[PDB]
Amino acid sequence: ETSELCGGARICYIFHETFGRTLESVDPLGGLNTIDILTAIRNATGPRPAL
C-alpha cells in the first residue's frame, strides 16, 4: 500500500537521512577552545619540564 515510508527503506532513511546526517552535525571542532587546550597540554606535561 502506497503510504508513509515504513518497514524497509524507512530504516534505510534512519541509517542515512537521520543517522548519517546526525553524525555530520557533530563537532568536528566542537569543544576545542584553544586556550583550554593549552591548559590541557600543560596538564598533559604534568610535574615535569618538557622539550
Add this chain to the structure above:
Amino acid sequence: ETSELCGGARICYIFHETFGRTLESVDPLGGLNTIDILTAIRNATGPRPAL
C-alpha cells in the same frame, strides 16, 4: 422461433460483445500513478541501497 437472441449465439454474444468488450475497458494504465509507483519501487528496494 424468430425472437430475442437466446440459447446458443446469445452465449457467443456474452463471450464477445459482453465479456470481450468488458475486458477491453479494463485498465491497461488504470491505477498507474507515476508518483505512487516511484514510492512503490522505493518500497521494493527496501532497507538496502540500490544501483
